[PDB]
C-alpha cells in the first residue's frame, strides 16, 4: 500500500498513453461533442485519503473493459493500447494493494458503493454516446477526452494539496 507520498508515475504515465493514442484535436470535433456529466462529488469531495481507492480500482475496471472492446481496439492504436492495458493493470494492482492489506480503505459505509455505481452509470452514458455516433472518430476523441480528464483528476486527492483553507 502506498502510505508515504514519495513519488508517483502512475497517473503521469496514463497522461502520456492517452495522449499518444490521440487522433485529432478537440476543436476539430466542435460538432459531435457534449458534456457527459463527470461526477466530481464522489471523487474530490468526502473521499480524500485512500477512501477513494476502491472507487478508482473499480473505475479502472470500466476503463479497461471499455477500451478492451473490439471497437476501441480497432479505433485506437492496438500497440499503444497494449501499454494502456499494462499500466491499467499496474494501477489496479497498486490500488487493490491497500484493499488487500488491513488499511482503512473499505471501512466507509454504503457511500463507497455509491461512487462505484455513479462511475458505472457515468461510463454507461458513454456507451450510449458511442452507439449514437456509430463509433465515429470524433466521438472517440470526446470519449477519450472525458476519460482523460476524469482519470487525471482521479488521484487528485493525493495531488491537490495546495489549498487547505
Partner 1 sequence: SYDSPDYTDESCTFKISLRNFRSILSWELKNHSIVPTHYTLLYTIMSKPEDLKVVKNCANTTRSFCDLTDEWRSTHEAYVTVLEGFSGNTTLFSCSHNFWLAIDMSFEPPEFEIVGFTNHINVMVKFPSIVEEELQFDLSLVIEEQSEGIVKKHKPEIKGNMSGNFTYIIDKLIPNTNYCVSVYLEHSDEQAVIKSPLKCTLLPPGQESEFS
Q: Which residues bind partner 1 (CB under 8 A)?
A: 9, 12-13, 15-16, 19, 22, 25-30, 33-35, 38, 142, 145-146, 148-149, 152-153, 156, 159-162
In Å, how far from its chain's centre is CA 45? 16
CB atoms within 10 A of CB 136: 14
Smallest distance, partner 1 to C-beta of residue 154, A = 10
Closest to partner 1 by CB, 34 vs 120, is: 34
Between CA 51 and CA 26 the distance in angstroms is: 33
Closest to partner 1 by CB, 99 vs 148, is: 148
Of 152, 11, 146, 154, nearest in space to 67 by CA: 146
Give how far Cα 29 sits from Cα of 12, 34, 46, Å.
26, 10, 35
Residue 77 contacts residue 83 (beta carbons within 8 Å): no
Smallest distance, partner 1 to C-beta of residue 161, A = 8
Smallest distance, partner 1 to C-beta of residue 46, A = 19
Closest to partner 1 by CB, 134 vs 162, is: 162
Provide the 3-class DSSP secondary structure of residue 33: coil
Smallest distance, partner 1 to C-beta of residue 101, A = 26
Between CA 30 and CA 44 the distance in angstroms is: 28
Smallest distance, partner 1 to C-beta of residue 116, A = 22
Closest to partner 1 by CB, 113 vs 159, is: 159
Between CA 157 and CA 164 the distance in angstroms is: 12
Amino acid at each position: 500500500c502506498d502510505l508515504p507520498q514519495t513519488h508517483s508515475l502512475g497517473s503521469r504515465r496514463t497522461l502520456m498513453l492517452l495522449a499518444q493514442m490521440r487522433k485529432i484535436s478537440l476543436f476539430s470535433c466542435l460538432k459531435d461533442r457534449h458534456d457527459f456529466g463527470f461526477p466530481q462529488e464522489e471523487f474530490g469531495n468526502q473521499f480524500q485519503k485512500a477512501e477513494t481507492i476502491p472507487v478508482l480500482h473499480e473505475m479502472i475496471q470500466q476503463i479497461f473493459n471499455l477500451f478492451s472492446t473490439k471497437d476501441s481496439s480497432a479505433a485506437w492504436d492496438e500497440t499503444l493500447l497494449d501499454k494502456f492495458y499494462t499500466e491499467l493493470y499496474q494501477q489496479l494492482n497498486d490500488l487493490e494493494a491497500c484493499v488487500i492489506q488491513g488499511v482503512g480503505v473499505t471501512e466507509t459505509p454504503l457511500m463507497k458503493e455509491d461512487s462505484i455505481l455513479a462511475v458505472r452509470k457515468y461510463f454507461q452514458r458513454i456507451t450510449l454516446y458511442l452507439k449514437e455516433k456509430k463509433y465515429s472518430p470524433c466521438a472517440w476523441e470526446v470519449v477519450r477526452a472525458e476519460i482523460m480528464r476524469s482519470f487525471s483528476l482521479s488521484t487528485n486527492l493525493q495531488e491537490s494539496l495546495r489549498s487547505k483553507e
